[PDB]
Amino acid sequence: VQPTPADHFTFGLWTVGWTGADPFGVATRKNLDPVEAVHKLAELGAYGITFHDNDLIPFDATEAEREKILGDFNQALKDTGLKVPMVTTNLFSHPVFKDGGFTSNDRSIRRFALAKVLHNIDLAAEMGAETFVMWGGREGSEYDGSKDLAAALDRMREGVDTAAGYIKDKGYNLRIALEPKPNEPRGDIFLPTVGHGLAFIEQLEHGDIVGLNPETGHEQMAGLNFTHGIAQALWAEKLFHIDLNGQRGIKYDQDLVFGHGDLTSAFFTVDLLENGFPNGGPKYTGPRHFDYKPSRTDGYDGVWDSAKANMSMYLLLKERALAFRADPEVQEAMKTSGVFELGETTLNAGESAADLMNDSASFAGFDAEAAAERNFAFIRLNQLAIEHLLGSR
Amino acid sequence: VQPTPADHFTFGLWTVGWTGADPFGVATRKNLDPVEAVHKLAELGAYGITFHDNDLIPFDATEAEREKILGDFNQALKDTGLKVPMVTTNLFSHPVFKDGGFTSNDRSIRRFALAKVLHNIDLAAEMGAETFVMWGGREGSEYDGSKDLAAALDRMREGVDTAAGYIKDKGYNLRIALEPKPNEPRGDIFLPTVGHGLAFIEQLEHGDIVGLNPETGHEQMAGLNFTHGIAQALWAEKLFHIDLNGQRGIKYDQDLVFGHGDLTSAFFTVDLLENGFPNGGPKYTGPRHFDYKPSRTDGYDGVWDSAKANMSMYLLLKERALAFRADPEVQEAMKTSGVFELGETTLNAGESAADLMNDSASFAGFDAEAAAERNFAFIRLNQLAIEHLLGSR
Amino acid sequence: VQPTPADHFTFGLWTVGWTGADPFGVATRKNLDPVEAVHKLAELGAYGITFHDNDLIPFDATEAEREKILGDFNQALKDTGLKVPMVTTNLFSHPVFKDGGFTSNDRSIRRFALAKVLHNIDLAAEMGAETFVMWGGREGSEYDGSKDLAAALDRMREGVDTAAGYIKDKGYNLRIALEPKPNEPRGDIFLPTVGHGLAFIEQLEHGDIVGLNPETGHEQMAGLNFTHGIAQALWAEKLFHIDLNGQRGIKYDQDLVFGHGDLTSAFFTVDLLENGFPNGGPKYTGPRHFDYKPSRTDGYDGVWDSAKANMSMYLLLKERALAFRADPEVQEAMKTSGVFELGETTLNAGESAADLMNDSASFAGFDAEAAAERNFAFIRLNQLAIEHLLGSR
Amino acid sequence: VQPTPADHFTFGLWTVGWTGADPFGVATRKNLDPVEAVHKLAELGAYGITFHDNDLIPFDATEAEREKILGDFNQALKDTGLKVPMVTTNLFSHPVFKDGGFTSNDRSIRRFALAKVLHNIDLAAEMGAETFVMWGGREGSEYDGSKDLAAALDRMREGVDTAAGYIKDKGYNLRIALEPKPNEPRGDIFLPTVGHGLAFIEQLEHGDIVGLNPETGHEQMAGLNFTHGIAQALWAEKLFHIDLNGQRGIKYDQDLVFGHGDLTSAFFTVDLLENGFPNGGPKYTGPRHFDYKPSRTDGYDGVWDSAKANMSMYLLLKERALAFRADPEVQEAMKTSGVFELGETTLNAGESAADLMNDSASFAGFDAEAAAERNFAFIRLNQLAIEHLLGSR
Ligand SMILES: O=C(O)[C@H](O)[C@@H](O)[C@H](O)[C@H](O)CO
Ligand SMILES: O=C(O)[C@H](O)[C@@H](O)[C@H](O)[C@H](O)CO
Ligand SMILES: O=C(O)[C@H](O)[C@@H](O)[C@H](O)[C@H](O)CO
Ligand SMILES: O=C(O)[C@H](O)[C@@H](O)[C@H](O)[C@H](O)CO
Ligand SMILES: [Mn+2]
Ligand SMILES: [Mn+2]
Ligand SMILES: [Mn+2]
Ligand SMILES: [Mn+2]
Ligand SMILES: [Mn+2]
Ligand SMILES: [Mn+2]
Ligand SMILES: [Mn+2]
Ligand SMILES: [Mn+2]
Incomplete structure (x- = not known):
C-alpha cells in the first residue's frame, strides 16, 4: 500500500467526525475538532478534505465566530498542504428542512434553502473547491399524495438552475454535482438513482456545468450494479465526483469502509476508475472521495484505523486490477x-x-x-x- | 365498472396466451389461437391488442405461412374492430439472443437483431401501430467483466438510432418506446430503471421520436416508487406508452393483474393517469396496456376472469380517485x-x-x-x- | 368506526412521544409529558399504554425522582382507567449497549444488561402487565468475524432463561415475547425473522412461558409475508403479542401507521386476527398494539391524528374483512x-x-x-x- | 488446488445437466447423458453425484425403461467409484403440482405426491444415500386468501412425518433435510428461511431424523446472512446437508458458482465449515454439495469449467480461511x-x-x-x- 497525495484520496469532515448517533442511540464518541481532523488526515496521506457548511460553521454562529473558525481552518490547511476539492451544504438536519430545502412545500423555506446555497457557493469559491455537491436528502415524501410530482421537479430545476447561473455570473471555477439516493431519510427521495439524476440534468437551462456524484451504497440500496451505473455516468461525460464506501444489501445506508461491502463489485469499480474501458473511451480523473462512517462500536483508534483501511483497500484492489488486465x-x-x-x-x-x-x-x-x-x-x-x-x- | 373501447384498454397476445411455463415447470394450459384471442378480447371490451412478431409468426414460418397467418389475423381484427396500437419484437427467446440482440458480443448476432427489428418496423406501419416497443431483456451480464460497458451503450445507441432513422426515412407514423427492467433474465440489464432509459434517450441522434414504456412491476423490482418514476417520464414529455400489472415485492417478475400488487400505489398511479397533476401540467393520453400473466394454477376461465379483472380494477380505482380529488x-x-x-x-x-x-x-x-x-x-x-x-x- | 376499550388498542409511550430525531436530523417536536400521553390516549379510545423503562424513568434518575414519576404515572392511570398490558426494557440507546446487552462481547456489560432486565420484571409485575417484550436491537454485527455465533446464541439463551426462571420463582403472571428484526441498527441482527425466533424458543430451558411479538414492518424488511409469519406463530401457539404499523418496502424501519404501508397484506392480517383460520384453529386474543411513529413533518395535531388513524384503519379493515367472509x-x-x-x-x-x-x-x-x-x-x-x-x- | 474425493464435493445431475431454458427462452444446450455426467464428474475430482427421481427416470417411463436407465447409471457408478449421498423428489415440474405436492388444495394430488415420495425413499435406500432432501417449491401462494394457513402446515406435517415414520419402520439409514426458499416459483413459499424450517421441525412427531438443507442463494433472496443462518442450524444440531452457489442480491434464483456472488460472505461460510466456532462447538461433516447452473451463454466447455470453478473457489477460500485463523x-x-x-x-x-x-x-x-x-x-x-x-x- 502506502497512499500519497498523488492518489487523490479525499475524506469528508463528517466521516471521521461521525460520533455515533444513529436512530436507536446517542453518540458513542466525543466531538472531533476540525483542526485536529486536518492534521490527522494529512499525517495519513490524504490529499484533501471536504465539508458541509454546518460541519465547520454552526447554524447559529455569529459573523465573528465564522471568521475565528475559518482562520484556524485556513491555517491548518496551510500548515499541512491539504486542498479543499469539494464543498457541500447541509439542507437536511435543522428542523426547518423537514419537507426539504428546494422542494419544500413551504415557499419561504424554499427561498431560505436557496439563499443558504448561494452563500455556500461564495465560500466554495474562496476555498478553491472545483465541485459543489448537492445531496437532496429531504426532497421527497412518505405518502404519494403529499406532493404535486411535476411541481416538485420544477422547484428542483429552479433551485439548481439559479445556483448554476450564479456560478456562471460570478465566473467561479465550479461545477455542481447531484447526489442520488433512493430513500432514507424520506420514504422516497426525488432523483433516486444515477439514471434519474442524469435525465433530470438534460432538462436544465445550465446543464453544461451540472453532473453527478454517485455513491456506492446508494445505488446498492435499489439493488443496482454500481459499475454499470458509473459506466453510464462516465459514458455521458457526467461523472464529476464519486463517493466510495460499502453496503451489504438493501437496508439502511450503512457507510462501511470501501471494500467492506460487495467486494467483487468494489474490484470492478476500481478496474473502471483506474483502467477505464477495454476498447478505450472516457476516463474519470477526479478525486477518490470516501463518504463512510466508522462503526459506533469502536473508539478513536478505530476512526483512524478505518480511515487508513479505505486507502489500503483501494490500493490493494488497484494492484490486483492492474495485474488482471495485464495478464x-x-x-x-x-x-x-x-x-x-x-x-x-x-x-x-x-x-x-x-x-x-x-x-x-x-x-x-x-x-x-x-x-x-x-x-x-x-x-x-x-x-x-x-x-x-x-x-x- | 363495464369497460368500453373509449377507455383504451389494450392487452398483449402473450398475456392471455401465456401457457404457464416458468423456470420450474411446463405449461399448464393449451396454446391459445390468436383469432380466438381477438374475438374473446373484443367481446370483453378491449380497444386493441398488441403482439411480438413471434407471438403471431413463428421464427421459422415460410413466406407462405406468414401471409396465411396474417390474412386470418387481419380479418378477425376487421370482424371485431380491434386496433393494433403497439407492436414489438422478440429478441430474447431464441438461443441466438443468449447475450442480447443489439448489445450481443457477437457482431453477426448484432446485425441479425437489427435486421429482425427493421422488418418488424415495416409490419408495425402496415398494422397501423403508433408505438414500437423495445424491451432489451437479454442486454446485460451476470459478471461485471463480460462487457466493455461504454461499448455496450454505443451498440445500444447504434441499434436504436438506426431503427429511428429508418422510421423517419420511410415517413412511418411511429415512435419508439424503450422498456426498462433491472434484472431477469440477465443478472443486470442495461437501462435498468425509468431514469437510466430517460438519460440514454438524450444521447441519441434521433431522440425526438424515442420515449419510454415503463412497467409497474419492473420499477418495483428495484423498490422504486412507480408514480414518482412515471411522473418524471411525464414531466420530461417522454411517457409514450405504459405497461400496467402487479408485483408484490423485490423478487422475480410476477406480472399479476393490475391492483393485485401494491394497492395504494396502483391508486396513485390511476390518479396521475386520469387526473394528472394538482397544479396542472402534462397528461398521459395514450392507451392503458396490461402486460400481465394469468396465474398458472387456473384454467381458461381464469384467463378470461383475469383479463376482466384488469379492467374492473382500473375502473374501480378511477372512480375512487375521481371522488377523492373532488372532495x-x-x-x-x-x-x-x-x-x-x-x-x-x-x-x-x-x-x-x-x-x-x-x-x-x-x-x-x-x-x-x-x-x-x-x-x-x-x-x-x-x-x-x-x-x-x-x-x- | 369509533374505538372503544373493548377493541384493545394499545400504544407505546415512545410512539406518540417520538420527537422526530432520525440519523440525518434533530427532533421537530418537544418532549411529551407522560401524564398527558395517558389522558390523550384515554380520550381517543385506547385500551392501554405500554413503555420501555427509560421512556418513563431516565437512565440517571435518583430514587426521589423515580418515585415522583411513578406517582404521576400511576395517578394518570387511576384517573383514566388505562391498563398497562406490556412493559419492555431499553437495551439499545445508552453507549454501553453499542455491541448488545445480552450478547455484548464484554461480560461486565452482559451482567449489567441482565440486572437491568430483572429489575424491570419487578416493575412490570407491579404495573399489572401480562407481557414482557424483549427486542434485541443491538444483538448482532456489521462484520462476519466480530462474533462467535454459537456463543452469541448461548449468551442469548442464558439471559432469556434467567429472566424466565426468575418469573417462575417469583410467581409473576408474565410471559416473555421475543421480537425479531433482521437489521437496523446493526447490519445483521440475531433471530431476524419469526422463523428464527420460534426456532430459538425450542432450545430454551423455560420455553413454555416464552413466545413471540412479531412486528409488521420488521417481517417486511426481509420481504416476507407478514400474514404467513403470524400464522406459523399461531399454529405453534406462540403468538403472545403483536406490533402493527406500516412499511413501504425493503428499507429502513418506517413505522408508518397501520394500513399506510402494504394495504392488501394489512387486510389479510386483520382477517386472520378477526376471522381466525377458515377450517378452524387457534385465535389471537391479546392487545392490538401499534408501534409506529408520527411522521416528523407533522406537528402535534398530526400526532393525535395518526394515533386516531391507526384505530380507524384497523376498524375499517375489520368491517370489510367481516363482510368479505360473510359473503x-x-x-x-x-x-x-x-x-x-x-x-x-x-x-x-x-x-x-x-x-x-x-x-x-x-x-x-x-x-x-x-x-x-x-x-x-x-x-x-x-x-x-x-x-x-x-x-x- | 486440486480436489480429491476426500474433499467431498458433490454435484446434482440437474446442475451440469441444466439445459438453459429460463422463463424468457429455450434451452441453449443439448440434454446431458447421465452416464457421461458421472464419468466427467469422476475425472474432475467429484466425490459423489445426486439427483431428483425425474432427472434420471422420466415421469412416464415404462418398467423396462426404468430398469435400463438404472442399469446404465449403476454401471457408471461401479466404473468410477462415485457415491450417491443424497436423493430428492421432483414435486414441482409436472402441471399436477401447480399448487404444491404436500400442500396442494386438492387431496387426490396430496396423496399422489406422498406416494411419489415413499417410492423414492425406497430408491434412495437402494442407492446408499444418507440424505433425503425435500424442497417444497410449489408449496405456497401468489394471493393471501388462497390458503388456510394452519391447514397448510398440518398438511406439510402429515407428509413429512409419514415419510419419517416409513423410514423408521423400514430401518433405512436416512435422515430428511428440508430446504427453505422464500419465493419463486410461488409468490410466497411456506417455510421460507432457515428459521421457519427449524421451527417447523419442532412440531413434528418424528423430528429426530428431520433437519435442514440451507442453500446460499435462497437465504440471500430474503437479504439474510447465510453464515448467521447456518450457525443457528449447527447450534441446534440440525445442519444435515448444505447447498452452495452464488447470488448477487435480492432477485430471481441465480444459482451462480459458489464464490461468484457475495465473496466475503462465501469466505466466512467456508471459515465456519472448516474452522468451526472460535470457542468450540459442533462442526459440519457432510458433503459440500453445489446446486448451481452453468450460465446459459456458455457451451459445453463452459459446463466443465464451471463445475471445476466451484471446487477451486472452495479450495482457494479454504486456504485463505485456514491462514487467516492461524495468523x-x-x-x-x-x-x-x-x-x-x-x-x-x-x-x-x-x-x-x-x-x-x-x-x-x-x-x-x-x-x-x-x-x-x-x-x-x-x-x-x-x-x-x-x-x-x-x-x-
Ligand atoms: O451524513 C451525511 O452528512 C450525509 O450522509 C452525506 O454523507 C450525504 O450522503 C452527501 O454526500 C453529502 O451531503
Ligand atoms: O413475456 C414477455 O413476452 C415479456 O415479459 C414482455 O411482456 C416484456 O416485458 C416487454 O413488454 C415486451 O417485450
Ligand atoms: O422505537 C423504539 O424504541 C424501538 O424501535 C422499539 O419500538 C422496538 O421496535 C421494539 O418493539 C420495542 O423495543
Ligand atoms: O433446479 C432444480 O431442479 C431445483 O431448483 C432444485 O435444485 C432445488 O433448489 C432443491 O435444492 C432441490 O429440489
Ligand atoms: Mn450514504
Ligand atoms: Mn454521499
Ligand atoms: Mn414484467
Ligand atoms: Mn412489459
Ligand atoms: Mn419497527
Ligand atoms: Mn416493535
Ligand atoms: Mn437455488
Ligand atoms: Mn437447492
Whole structure:
C-alpha cells in the first residue's frame, strides 16, 4: 500500500467526525475538532478534505465566530498542504428542512434553502473547491399524495438552475454535482438513482456545468450494479465526483469502509476508475472521495484505523486490477468472449438501414442455429477475475 | 365498472396466451389461437391488442405461412374492430439472443437483431401501430467483466438510432418506446430503471421520436416508487406508452393483474393517469396496456376472469380517485399541506440570484425556528386518500 | 368506526412521544409529558399504554425522582382507567449497549444488561402487565468475524432463561415475547425473522412461558409475508403479542401507521386476527398494539391524528374483512378453490404409509394429466377479496 | 488446488445437466447423458453425484425403461467409484403440482405426491444415500386468501412425518433435510428461511431424523446472512446437508458458482465449515454439495469449467480461511475485540437471578459510562479478514 497525495484520496469532515448517533442511540464518541481532523488526515496521506457548511460553521454562529473558525481552518490547511476539492451544504438536519430545502412545500423555506446555497457557493469559491455537491436528502415524501410530482421537479430545476447561473455570473471555477439516493431519510427521495439524476440534468437551462456524484451504497440500496451505473455516468461525460464506501444489501445506508461491502463489485469499480474501458473511451480523473462512517462500536483508534483501511483497500484492489488486465491469459479469455468484438460497429462504414435489410446474409440467409452454438465462456472469464482478486494468479 | 373501447384498454397476445411455463415447470394450459384471442378480447371490451412478431409468426414460418397467418389475423381484427396500437419484437427467446440482440458480443448476432427489428418496423406501419416497443431483456451480464460497458451503450445507441432513422426515412407514423427492467433474465440489464432509459434517450441522434414504456412491476423490482418514476417520464414529455400489472415485492417478475400488487400505489398511479397533476401540467393520453400473466394454477376461465379483472380494477380505482380529488375536505387538506404552494415559483417575477442573496428577510433575518413549527399534516392527507380508496368516504 | 376499550388498542409511550430525531436530523417536536400521553390516549379510545423503562424513568434518575414519576404515572392511570398490558426494557440507546446487552462481547456489560432486565420484571409485575417484550436491537454485527455465533446464541439463551426462571420463582403472571428484526441498527441482527425466533424458543430451558411479538414492518424488511409469519406463530401457539404499523418496502424501519404501508397484506392480517383460520384453529386474543411513529413533518395535531388513524384503519379493515367472509359468493369461491379441502387429512383413518404406497388408485393408476386440469380459480377469489376491501361489494 | 474425493464435493445431475431454458427462452444446450455426467464428474475430482427421481427416470417411463436407465447409471457408478449421498423428489415440474405436492388444495394430488415420495425413499435406500432432501417449491401462494394457513402446515406435517415414520419402520439409514426458499416459483413459499424450517421441525412427531438443507442463494433472496443462518442450524444440531452457489442480491434464483456472488460472505461460510466456532462447538461433516447452473451463454466447455470453478473457489477460500485463523496478528485482534470473552457464561457458577440483582457491582454501582469507553475494534478485525482473503497477507 502506502497512499500519497498523488492518489487523490479525499475524506469528508463528517466521516471521521461521525460520533455515533444513529436512530436507536446517542453518540458513542466525543466531538472531533476540525483542526485536529486536518492534521490527522494529512499525517495519513490524504490529499484533501471536504465539508458541509454546518460541519465547520454552526447554524447559529455569529459573523465573528465564522471568521475565528475559518482562520484556524485556513491555517491548518496551510500548515499541512491539504486542498479543499469539494464543498457541500447541509439542507437536511435543522428542523426547518423537514419537507426539504428546494422542494419544500413551504415557499419561504424554499427561498431560505436557496439563499443558504448561494452563500455556500461564495465560500466554495474562496476555498478553491472545483465541485459543489448537492445531496437532496429531504426532497421527497412518505405518502404519494403529499406532493404535486411535476411541481416538485420544477422547484428542483429552479433551485439548481439559479445556483448554476450564479456560478456562471460570478465566473467561479465550479461545477455542481447531484447526489442520488433512493430513500432514507424520506420514504422516497426525488432523483433516486444515477439514471434519474442524469435525465433530470438534460432538462436544465445550465446543464453544461451540472453532473453527478454517485455513491456506492446508494445505488446498492435499489439493488443496482454500481459499475454499470458509473459506466453510464462516465459514458455521458457526467461523472464529476464519486463517493466510495460499502453496503451489504438493501437496508439502511450503512457507510462501511470501501471494500467492506460487495467486494467483487468494489474490484470492478476500481478496474473502471483506474483502467477505464477495454476498447478505450472516457476516463474519470477526479478525486477518490470516501463518504463512510466508522462503526459506533469502536473508539478513536478505530476512526483512524478505518480511515487508513479505505486507502489500503483501494490500493490493494488497484494492484490486483492492474495485474488482471495485464495478464495475457485474461487478454485471450477477453478476446474469446467477444469483449473487443463489442467495440466494432454493427453497420459497415457507409452501410444504411436499407442496405442491411437487403443484405441476405444478415437476415434471410443467416444461420441462427449455428450462431447460437458459440461458447461465450463468461464463466471462465469470471473465474480469472476472482483468482486475480484472491491474489492466486 | 363495464369497460368500453373509449377507455383504451389494450392487452398483449402473450398475456392471455401465456401457457404457464416458468423456470420450474411446463405449461399448464393449451396454446391459445390468436383469432380466438381477438374475438374473446373484443367481446370483453378491449380497444386493441398488441403482439411480438413471434407471438403471431413463428421464427421459422415460410413466406407462405406468414401471409396465411396474417390474412386470418387481419380479418378477425376487421370482424371485431380491434386496433393494433403497439407492436414489438422478440429478441430474447431464441438461443441466438443468449447475450442480447443489439448489445450481443457477437457482431453477426448484432446485425441479425437489427435486421429482425427493421422488418418488424415495416409490419408495425402496415398494422397501423403508433408505438414500437423495445424491451432489451437479454442486454446485460451476470459478471461485471463480460462487457466493455461504454461499448455496450454505443451498440445500444447504434441499434436504436438506426431503427429511428429508418422510421423517419420511410415517413412511418411511429415512435419508439424503450422498456426498462433491472434484472431477469440477465443478472443486470442495461437501462435498468425509468431514469437510466430517460438519460440514454438524450444521447441519441434521433431522440425526438424515442420515449419510454415503463412497467409497474419492473420499477418495483428495484423498490422504486412507480408514480414518482412515471411522473418524471411525464414531466420530461417522454411517457409514450405504459405497461400496467402487479408485483408484490423485490423478487422475480410476477406480472399479476393490475391492483393485485401494491394497492395504494396502483391508486396513485390511476390518479396521475386520469387526473394528472394538482397544479396542472402534462397528461398521459395514450392507451392503458396490461402486460400481465394469468396465474398458472387456473384454467381458461381464469384467463378470461383475469383479463376482466384488469379492467374492473382500473375502473374501480378511477372512480375512487375521481371522488377523492373532488372532495372538498381533500381540497382543503391539500391546501393546508402546501400542495398548491409548491406550484408557486421560489423566486419573485424578476428576482435574481443576487436579489434573493441580499433580501434580508429570506436569509439573515429569517426565523428558521418559527418556520419549523408548521404542521404539514401529511398523515391526515394520507388518511383521507385511503378512506376514499376503501370506499368509506 | 369509533374505538372503544373493548377493541384493545394499545400504544407505546415512545410512539406518540417520538420527537422526530432520525440519523440525518434533530427532533421537530418537544418532549411529551407522560401524564398527558395517558389522558390523550384515554380520550381517543385506547385500551392501554405500554413503555420501555427509560421512556418513563431516565437512565440517571435518583430514587426521589423515580418515585415522583411513578406517582404521576400511576395517578394518570387511576384517573383514566388505562391498563398497562406490556412493559419492555431499553437495551439499545445508552453507549454501553453499542455491541448488545445480552450478547455484548464484554461480560461486565452482559451482567449489567441482565440486572437491568430483572429489575424491570419487578416493575412490570407491579404495573399489572401480562407481557414482557424483549427486542434485541443491538444483538448482532456489521462484520462476519466480530462474533462467535454459537456463543452469541448461548449468551442469548442464558439471559432469556434467567429472566424466565426468575418469573417462575417469583410467581409473576408474565410471559416473555421475543421480537425479531433482521437489521437496523446493526447490519445483521440475531433471530431476524419469526422463523428464527420460534426456532430459538425450542432450545430454551423455560420455553413454555416464552413466545413471540412479531412486528409488521420488521417481517417486511426481509420481504416476507407478514400474514404467513403470524400464522406459523399461531399454529405453534406462540403468538403472545403483536406490533402493527406500516412499511413501504425493503428499507429502513418506517413505522408508518397501520394500513399506510402494504394495504392488501394489512387486510389479510386483520382477517386472520378477526376471522381466525377458515377450517378452524387457534385465535389471537391479546392487545392490538401499534408501534409506529408520527411522521416528523407533522406537528402535534398530526400526532393525535395518526394515533386516531391507526384505530380507524384497523376498524375499517375489520368491517370489510367481516363482510368479505360473510359473503355467500366468497364462500362458494373458497369451496371451488379447495380452501376447505386443504383441512381434510391426506391419509384415511388408520391408513399407513405402506397402505398408501400399495393403493393403486393414488399412485400406479393415478391419472396425473387429468388431475392437472383443475381450475383452482385463485385469481377470481383474490378479485373478490380486493372488491370487498375497496367496498365495491 | 486440486480436489480429491476426500474433499467431498458433490454435484446434482440437474446442475451440469441444466439445459438453459429460463422463463424468457429455450434451452441453449443439448440434454446431458447421465452416464457421461458421472464419468466427467469422476475425472474432475467429484466425490459423489445426486439427483431428483425425474432427472434420471422420466415421469412416464415404462418398467423396462426404468430398469435400463438404472442399469446404465449403476454401471457408471461401479466404473468410477462415485457415491450417491443424497436423493430428492421432483414435486414441482409436472402441471399436477401447480399448487404444491404436500400442500396442494386438492387431496387426490396430496396423496399422489406422498406416494411419489415413499417410492423414492425406497430408491434412495437402494442407492446408499444418507440424505433425503425435500424442497417444497410449489408449496405456497401468489394471493393471501388462497390458503388456510394452519391447514397448510398440518398438511406439510402429515407428509413429512409419514415419510419419517416409513423410514423408521423400514430401518433405512436416512435422515430428511428440508430446504427453505422464500419465493419463486410461488409468490410466497411456506417455510421460507432457515428459521421457519427449524421451527417447523419442532412440531413434528418424528423430528429426530428431520433437519435442514440451507442453500446460499435462497437465504440471500430474503437479504439474510447465510453464515448467521447456518450457525443457528449447527447450534441446534440440525445442519444435515448444505447447498452452495452464488447470488448477487435480492432477485430471481441465480444459482451462480459458489464464490461468484457475495465473496466475503462465501469466505466466512467456508471459515465456519472448516474452522468451526472460535470457542468450540459442533462442526459440519457432510458433503459440500453445489446446486448451481452453468450460465446459459456458455457451451459445453463452459459446463466443465464451471463445475471445476466451484471446487477451486472452495479450495482457494479454504486456504485463505485456514491462514487467516492461524495468523497470530488475527488471534490477538480476536482477543481484543472480545471474541473469546463471549464464550464465558455471564453468570458465575451457582449464581442465581436474585444473587445477580443484589450484586451491587453489576447493577447499582456499575459504571456504564466507563464500560462504554471500550474500543471493540471490529473494523480492524474485519480489515485483517479481507487482507487474508485478497492474499495480501
Ligand atoms: O451524513 C451525511 O452528512 C450525509 O450522509 C452525506 O454523507 C450525504 O450522503 C452527501 O454526500 C453529502 O451531503
Ligand atoms: O413475456 C414477455 O413476452 C415479456 O415479459 C414482455 O411482456 C416484456 O416485458 C416487454 O413488454 C415486451 O417485450
Ligand atoms: O422505537 C423504539 O424504541 C424501538 O424501535 C422499539 O419500538 C422496538 O421496535 C421494539 O418493539 C420495542 O423495543
Ligand atoms: O433446479 C432444480 O431442479 C431445483 O431448483 C432444485 O435444485 C432445488 O433448489 C432443491 O435444492 C432441490 O429440489
Ligand atoms: Mn450514504
Ligand atoms: Mn454521499
Ligand atoms: Mn414484467
Ligand atoms: Mn412489459
Ligand atoms: Mn419497527
Ligand atoms: Mn416493535
Ligand atoms: Mn437455488
Ligand atoms: Mn437447492
